[PDB]
Amino acid sequence: SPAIPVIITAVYSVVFVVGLVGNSLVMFVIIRYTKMKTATNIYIFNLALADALVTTTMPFQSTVYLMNSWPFGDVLCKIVLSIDYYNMFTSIFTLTMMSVDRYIAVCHPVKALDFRTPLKAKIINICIWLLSSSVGISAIVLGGTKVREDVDVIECSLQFPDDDYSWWDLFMKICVFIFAFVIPVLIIIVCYTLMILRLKSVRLLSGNIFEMLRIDEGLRLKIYKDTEGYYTIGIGHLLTKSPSLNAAKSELDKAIGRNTNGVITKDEAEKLFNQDVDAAVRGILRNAKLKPVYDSLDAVRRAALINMVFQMGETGVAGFTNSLRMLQQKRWDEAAVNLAKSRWYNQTPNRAKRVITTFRTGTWDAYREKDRNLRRITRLVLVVVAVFVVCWTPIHIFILVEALGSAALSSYYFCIALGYTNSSLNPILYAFLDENFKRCFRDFCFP
Amino acid sequence: SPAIPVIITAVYSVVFVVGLVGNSLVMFVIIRYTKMKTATNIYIFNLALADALVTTTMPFQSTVYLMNSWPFGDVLCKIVLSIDYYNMFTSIFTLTMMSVDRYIAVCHPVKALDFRTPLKAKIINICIWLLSSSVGISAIVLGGTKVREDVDVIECSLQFPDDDYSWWDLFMKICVFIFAFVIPVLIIIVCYTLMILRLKSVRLLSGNIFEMLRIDEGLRLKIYKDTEGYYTIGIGHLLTKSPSLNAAKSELDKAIGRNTNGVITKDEAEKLFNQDVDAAVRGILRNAKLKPVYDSLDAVRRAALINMVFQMGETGVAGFTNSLRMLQQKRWDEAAVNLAKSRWYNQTPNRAKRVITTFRTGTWDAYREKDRNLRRITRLVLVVVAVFVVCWTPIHIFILVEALGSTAALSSYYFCIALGYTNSSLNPILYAFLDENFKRCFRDFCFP
Ligand SMILES: CC(C)[C@@H](CN1CC[C@@](C)(c2cccc(O)c2)[C@@H](C)C1)NC(=O)[C@H]1Cc2ccc(O)cc2CN1
């Protein structure tokens, strides 16, 4: 059909421009602005660099395809080959190191922002370029031109010993498939499967029940009066309801084991708290309605349940039958919507929300403000990798299959088209999945 | 040479993308945003619509270039051609009206209120497309592919009755040249000369001695030490040369009429400034060397003379006897040359050059921000017209020359149409850099 060339020409151009103008824009935006040089970005720079270099080979790819020969002579042949191979290795290694970076990021939100973290990244980038020189440089040496057959066409390619070109070619191409694909991709996959585990682990262990109730119930090292006027101390520990400070001091002294005079140490208050928690838990497991719900909840949502018993007691909580069964069916919002309608919510809105937020999200976000950036950045890296693999897999299997086996040139060019498309996609991905890039691109391209 | 193909592919690509994407973006922005509905922008839309269409033909051209023939058959041939012509006539007629529209904004402000509206511009746009349809539709009619002889190449082109073919082509090419270039360009030239003349004419009514000295002398409402260290206030008003600050305060407290404590209102600053100016003018009229010169000078150059006295004093200025004589003979350049030799020019070059330029030009040009002469939007249009002409001149003359009168020049034709294609992708970029609004709306669209 007459449309094919037109469509291909158009697509080809868009990819080249976005791929070349896109990545070159990224590289610059970073190098110039110290404001944004982060472990993740320094890698992206390396990525964009490889992706920009490779995009400049498009006008060679096509012009070669049109003439069906290599006009560019030896030098250019040796160069674009070393690019071809540098891009291939450089970008995959970078993405693996990015994943690894994200991996150690989930347990270190503090070190992520440091003097070294960005610097280490710079160094690694180089190490990647040195390792890639392995095949990058050998591409410069082996790269060469030859006049094939009777045809007046010229071929640009790596030149191995004649006849045994087959073995060395097969040898190299397999090595490529091992090191530039199999290893990194699996390493990456392992990197993420484990990362989601560390995240699950961090979402439970990022907060304890002590930090929770200390925010809702407060902490006092001296006897004080409840909101209802009752004498209490520490974290929501009712001493007595009777209006005698001497009784509150009496009851308190039995609680600690010494003569307190209405004054307890922080440590003592923790011991008291831990006893009160245990007491509440024993009460939950003794209660017919709460036990099954408690057993069925994750530790974070359990904390919320304990939190409620602390405030209104075991009996008070069991009356939320409609919301309890919903939790036991893991219908988190349905539960959250019902609890908000309760009187408990009306008379203590702020706290109630924090508890409901816990039941709904299954996290400590209500109590322990989490940085949304770590998750946003991590999903940036994930997607970029995801897209890469999708785009570079067709080409890696196609080169492997042709070599291992004994028309179909269309498939090659399609596979080639993806790898090129990947390079024009990344720049876009940076812009939509990282609000800092979007602000920098904006402020730079439209001031 | 091996590098040429690479360079062209790359440049071809960017031209295409920016051209198709850039003009698509313009049309969209103009359509969705109320503040983008303006006479000028309605033309811009029409223009970008033409630039977008012609850009869709780039991939066809590269194809026909490589295969050397037309694979797309007549239907696409007749279409791709009408676009070739539509684009040509539509775009140029728009820029003309765009220029005319601006000419009205400047030389017919009163009628401009009623004439310049998105609606009237839409109507005019439509006409341009109906007008262009005379060659756009006939292109559809005369468009067709004929298999060439002596070769197996298909040819997409206008098909006039053979035997008379050579002359019809020429007939049309001449007419296309007159109507799609010479005439619009002339009108545009007339428009833009009438504008600058009236802008120049108005700009010299928007200046005066006061605004002039406010810039040269500056303004500070609290007491400060001048360039030579003497206490000063307001607009270059020297209080005293005594370094007491209390005498400065005592000098200010007097003649203002209150105890200022070293701080005056902006109104009090003018009161003083007006007094200093009146004093300078009274100074000029009492001095026999300056009076006759002052009298013979026009308003603007009179200000230039008052400025000088204001700075270095009546007597000081009257020592420029050679320059003064030349100024009373209306020989400005010769006088400006002398004044530049003065110590006044060496000590305070920036100011002196501005004052001298005023005596030279007789205008306030020395007291503006460079090319603030034309407005943000008028400047835009004038740049877009310029680039267009520069870009479309080569192809127009080329087509015409060959038509009157050589197989290696094929490379020229291709360079000439590269300028045309390139101009289509340039506009979108110019809109962004030369219009704060486009720049603003592109931003929101691309990077929310
Ligand atoms: C966009 C990406 C996927 C292109 C970039 N590249 C750059 C160099 C290139 C333009 C070229 C270079 C030399 C001669 C020629 O005909 C074509 C042409 C191979 C395309 N990369 C490749 O084609 C890679 C894919 C690959 C996969 C496995 C393996 O063992 C070796 C290779 C080497 N070529």
Ligand SMILES: CC(C)[C@@H](CN1CC[C@@](C)(c2cccc(O)c2)[C@@H](C)C1)NC(=O)[C@H]1Cc2ccc(O)cc2CN1
């Ligand atoms: C970008 C602009 C300047 C191109 C766009 N255009 C679009 C159509 C075109 C691709 C084409 C159309 C049909 C066959 C063919 O080989 C080529 C090819 C003429 C290029 N337009 C032209 O070159 C104009 C230039 C011109 C100047 C004087 C005149 O009497 C007639 C014409 C007609 N074509």
